[PDB]
Design a protein around this ligand. Structure first.
Ligand code: SPH
Ligand code: SPH
Lengths: 242, 245, 53, 296, 242, 99, 53, 49, 49
């Protein structure tokens, strides 16, 4: 017959290979597809949806697991005190593991784009105050006071009729893409830090509670992309699933 | 303009003066089944004004230590009025829904609620506490009726999934500082054009207080929560005897 | 060939049999609808304007 | 139709009104030049999360930016790029002496929920519609390849399942079957979409049978008959017992994938197949923890 | 020669594969085909032909095997008594196993369409009566009396010059296709029940027999289809066919 | 008594709705029903025995030896087709040996 | 090639030899004649009218 | 029978012959025999730079 | 299928052979290439220094 030759790649089974295979049921026609609402074509649509960010991941008891979803605010002495700090790496361990964006980025090695964080104030109608939320680009240590924290990109938030404000973490990096960062050599890919400071105070009249809570929601922007699909770091199986 | 609203369907009306717009789930409105999608041959019945109207189920009290509640649809309305009679007289069912949740307080109270709709909300068990016993939840927990059921582990949503990602579902918030109502519109969600109303539940409604309620002593300590719903574009087919179970 | 595939995507497949469900995966169409989940609201509002007033 | 309630009626409108539409987007969005703003009445930063929608603020509204042309591709996050990767879905053991399958044949019910890595991926959505591709890798417990003839038969639901190595059901006059050696490369075939519905569903909130649902019939909750696609059967082709022990591993890869209605990903460990049960005593948080919120 | 590669599907024997093979007899021409009457091109033509339905599958003795083909009717007390009941699943075990439609559907997993049942009265010319035949869609229990049975789809049959009436079992289901139903989880696919009740009475004059018999014939409609071919549940061989 | 089937339809007996049927009838053809391989014969060549101990065997071509294919083929009276025979050889235990 | 196949059906076969009976099964033509067995009567009668009168 | 798995940075590395990471649901993997000709594949440019 | 024949050069691994191989990462797009000064296209340019 036709003379051929075999090359050093035969007889192997590559799991990511895409080819043709022999059908088992000939002349089989599947069931027609009716209209179903809510079809997803790309994962970035889900990556653009906000989810709750556990900034306050201190408690671990079963009864106190619901306390990780918010962090408090209260009246201070007026010195410009610090409220909370956290990192800006969605793929790293920490607060971002509770969002859908972090879980989806856990399957991809590299990412690129801008992020978005939204804080909602859940106090009484009679409470007022102002806050400073600052983002420190990589290379700078944890700010010691508000004077050093004001030198990065920041926003000043005033409580009022609109209960939420948004902080945008812009894309500032030397490389086009970032790999997943961790302690050691791979801390070359840090994104920076986010800090929350008191601007003036938390003022409240007579007859209203002295403590309120803040909910943080996180998502991605329209330039966010990922590549080089891999497997998730955590496997949810401790033995044989019977 | 976006604060005041009125909802009129059938012979019932709802007026509110503190709102945060209306969410239309998955960007789609309820509608009737087309000829290409339909499979049964008998013509369905569309009673219209007698079944598409607002129903109120019950009132639940919000405490400083509440966990959360959940309801199952259309299991709540299988015993209420003409909708219940039609649902238990026919075999096939389809409809949309409109959900309105009400909770009001003063200007000195604080709190927050998350109201979400999750299709095919299957309930799991604690597996005896050690994962060794393969138990299943009783019929009371799976379909609690119109009285609802209270969550035991709200962090895992009683099903092993985090609550912090529940915002991916159609949802709103009730912040006592901003608004006092939440409105969601849901189309018919299923992989079949028609289904049984006594064996299948399309979705579930979750009300979980993320930020706890607080107030100073002397104010009103009773803060109720009320649920109002109305079917939209209801259809029935497969007439037979009346079965309740 | 028989048109019995499971699938506005997947247009560049390669096949050797008469059943369409044995072809290659191919390339899909790059389209996104973020507003289905991000902005399911009824009355759209401008970014500049206050959302609630 | 004469009364002016039927003429004006909207009953019977079967067209779906869609608020949104899909647009081409092969690459990430660009960034344009922006400058400072000092005005009253325009507040892109102030939002209202109680509405239930995401923030619409952009880069240009909050800081001063430069013109950047983005050419990064979005083709790796599609469903076919995410799901068309083979993974282990089952395993069959055929020992010489033992208690599981000592007679030389085995039956395996087709399911995906047996292993966590693919189960967690597939359970991100509620409905899914796809074709399949099954590959069977056979060897000994130590990995050695030995000369032996095997037979795989696909048994659709309702067909009689074999009960012995010499059963009359192995005539495979109707059911598809495969004869393969252990010295050949692994066998692989194509599978269509066979559900009576329009899509497979991984979560079914309801009971499959009518009547009272008691506590001794609680093992029927959540069971969807539309996902039971049959049984996979395997035997060693012969009359006498084989000379070697065997192990069979199945890998399945999706193609022509569609999905609907995303839901939160699994948080706890898996315990049983087709069961959302979790360990009550040991509930762990989604991620790690630190000592204080004011430090790192 | 031409460089090629071998993929992980070689050397296997798939019984349902359709391909080319080397002919053994070259230049062989078969016998010409003459016209033969009664050629069948599709199995649905045979699925549309009526065959006797054994509703009365009570007796099992060899002498009494011919008594399964009909069931009796006689004079009653006038209360609206019950005559017979049976299920409407062609692929399930029971009355439908005696028809050609049931045997043909035994080779296919899924089916879809409307069915048709015909009853013929084989009494004397001087006998009269009326009957009610009712079909109960799935989900409803076995009717206790005629009042509950009248609530489903039914027909009222009057004996006369035309000795036969037809009852049509329309397609009422949630899914496009049904799988074969049996006790357990797969009773999700039941089609319902059929009942026969006395409407008025069986009236006969002096000199004519007091008992008559009814023959039931069953077939399918023009929208009936099946798919996913499989093997029959019963094999007619107990050992080696010598 | 005429000998023909009933001509009544869905629309004559009950009130129906407009349904568009797109279900295919391509799986019930004769080539879709019969083009599936099945066992039709078996030949044994033992070392010591009484059937074929000398190393050769003869088999008369027939289909009626096994019930699963016999019952399918005996649904009709006359049949005209081409064939495709596949021979699978091994030892009694299934082992493959050089021969 | 030699036209020695056993077969208004079977039109889409694939072959590599010169004998037509070695080709693939292919696709047949979807035609039915139910009236051959269902209605072999000589004088056809309307559904509305009584069959015997 | 041998198995080769490619583990991109950040993915969990196997720690035993029976590790759960060998399910290779996402990472590409190759199953090959020692009687087959040597296996070979293609690799793109993956640097972030 | 299609009748073929194997010639006395199969199953070998020539290191200087140039052919096609199966990709491991489908739909992967590499990082864009920016302008870098000092690109060399041929070794004779270095041989002339
Ligand atoms: C020699 C042929 C052997 C065939 C091997 C089995 C093929 C049958 C596959 C059926 C379709 C696979 C998908 C099954 C359905 C759902 O995925 C699962 N039920 C989920 O639990
Ligand atoms: C190396 C070639 C070996 C050839 C194997 C046998 C081929 C001869 C087949 C003849 C045609 C087969 C069909 C035979 C006729 C009827 O099917 C049977 N007589 C029915 O009893």
């Amino acid at each position: 017959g036709f003379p051929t030759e075999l090359k050093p790649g035969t007889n192997q089974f590559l799991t990511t290979d895409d080819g043709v295979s022999a059908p088992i049921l000939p002349n089989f026609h599947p069931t027609p597809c009716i209209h179903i609402p809510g079809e997803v074509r790309n994962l970035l649509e889900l990556c653009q949806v906000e989810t709750i960010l556990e900034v306050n991941n201190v408690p671990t008891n079963a009864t106190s697991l619901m306390e990780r979803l918010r962090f408090p605010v209260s009246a201070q002495a007026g010195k410009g005190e610090l409220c909370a700090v956290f990192r800006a790496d969605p793929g790293r361990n920490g607060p971002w593991q509770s969002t859908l964006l972090g879980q989806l980025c856990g399957y991809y090695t590299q990412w690129s784009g801008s992020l978005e964080v939204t804080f909602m104030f859940t106090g009484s109608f009679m409470a007022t105050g102002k806050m400073l939320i600052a983002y420190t680009p990589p290379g700078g240590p944890l700010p010691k006071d508000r004077a050093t924290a004001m030198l990065g990109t920041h926003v000043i938030w005033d409580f009022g009729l609109q209960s939420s404000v948004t902080l945008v973490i812009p894309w500032i990096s030397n490389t086009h893409y970032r790999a997943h960062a961790r302690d050691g050599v791979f801390d070359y890919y840090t994104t920076g830090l986010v800090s929350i400071w008191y601007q003036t105070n938390y003022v409240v009249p007579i007859g209203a509670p002295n403590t309120a809570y803040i909910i943080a929601l996180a998502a991605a922007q329209k330039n966010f992309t990922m590549k080089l699909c891999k497997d998730a770091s955590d496997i949810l199986q401790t033995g044989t699933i019977q | 303009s976006d604060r005041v609203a009125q909802l009129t369907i059938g012979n019932s009306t709802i007026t509110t003066q503190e709102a945060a717009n209306i969410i239309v789930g998955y960007g789609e409105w309820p509608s009737y089944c087309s000829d290409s999608d339909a499979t049964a041959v008998d013509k369905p019945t569309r009673p219209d004004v007698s079944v598409n109207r607002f129903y109120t189920l019950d009132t639940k009290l919000w405490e400083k230590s509440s966990k959360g509640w959940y309801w199952k649809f259309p299991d709540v309305l299988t015993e209420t009025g003409v909708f219940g009679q039609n649902a238990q007289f026919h075999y096939l069912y389809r409809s949309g829904f409109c959900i309105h949740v009400q909770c009001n307080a003063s200007k000195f109270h604080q709190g927050a609620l998350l109201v979400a709709v999750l299709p095919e909300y299957v309930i799991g068990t604690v597996a005896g506490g050690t994962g060794t016993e393969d138990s299943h939840p009783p019929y009371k927990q799976t379909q609690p009726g119109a009285d609802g059921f209270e969550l035991q582990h709200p962090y895992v949503l009683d099903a092993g999934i985090p609550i912090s990602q529940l915002t991916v579902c159609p949802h709103q918030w009730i912040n006592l500082r901003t608004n006092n109502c939440a409105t969601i519109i849901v189309p018919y969600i299923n992989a079949l054009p028609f289904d049984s109303a006594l064996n299948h539940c399309n979705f579930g409604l979750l009300v979980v207080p993320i930020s706890p309620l607080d107030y100073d002593q002397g104010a009103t300590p009773v803060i109720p929560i009320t649920i109002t719903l109305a079917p939209m574009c209801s259809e029935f087919a497969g007439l037979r005897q009346a079965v309740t179970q | 060939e028989n048109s019995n595939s499971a699938t506005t995507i997947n247009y560049t497949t390669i096949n050797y049999y008469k059943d369409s469900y044995a072809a290659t995966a191919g390339k899909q169409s790059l389209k996104q609808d973020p507003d289905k989940f991000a902005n399911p609201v009824k009355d759209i509002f401008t970014e500049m304007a206050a959302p609630l007033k | 139709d004469r009364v002016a309630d039927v003429i004006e009626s909207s009953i019977g409108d079967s067209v779906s009104r869609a608020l949104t539409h899909a647009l081409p987007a092969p690459t990430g969005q660009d960034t344009q030049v922006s400058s400072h703003r000092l005005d009253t009445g325009k507040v892109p930063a102030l939002q209202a999360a109680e509405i239930g929608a995401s923030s619409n603020a952009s880069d240009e509204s909050m800081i001063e930016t430069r013109c950047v042309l983005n050419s990064h591709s979005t083709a790796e996050t599609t469903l076919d790029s995410f799901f068309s990767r083979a993974g282990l879905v089952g395993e069959i053991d055929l020992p010489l002496k033992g208690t599981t399958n000592p007679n030389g044949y085995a039956n395996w019910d087709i399911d995906i929920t047996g292993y966590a890595q693919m189960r967690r991926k597939v359970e991100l959505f509620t409905y899914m519609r796809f074709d399949a591709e099954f590959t069977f890798v056979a060897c000994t417990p130590t990995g050695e390849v030995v000369p032996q003839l095997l037979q795989y038969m696909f048994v659709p639901p309702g067909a009689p399942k074999p009960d012995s190595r010499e059963s009359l059901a192995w005539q495979t006059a109707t059911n598809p079957s495969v004869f393969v050696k252990l010295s050949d490369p692994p066998a692989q075939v194509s599978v269509p979409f066979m559900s009576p519905a329009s899509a497979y569903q991984w979560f079914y909130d309801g009971y499959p049978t009518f009547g009272e649902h008691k506590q001794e019939k609680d093992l029927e909750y959540g069971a969807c008959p539309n996902n039971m696609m049959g049984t996979f059967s395997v035997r060693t082709v012969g009359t006498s017992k084989s000379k070697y022990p065997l192990v069979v591993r199945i890998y399945m890869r999706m193609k022509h994938v569609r999905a609907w209605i995303p839901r939160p990903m699994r948080n706890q460990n898996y315990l049983f197949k087709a069961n959302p049960n979790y360990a009550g005593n040991s509930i762990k948080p989604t991620g790690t923890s630190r000592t204080a919120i004011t430090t790192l």
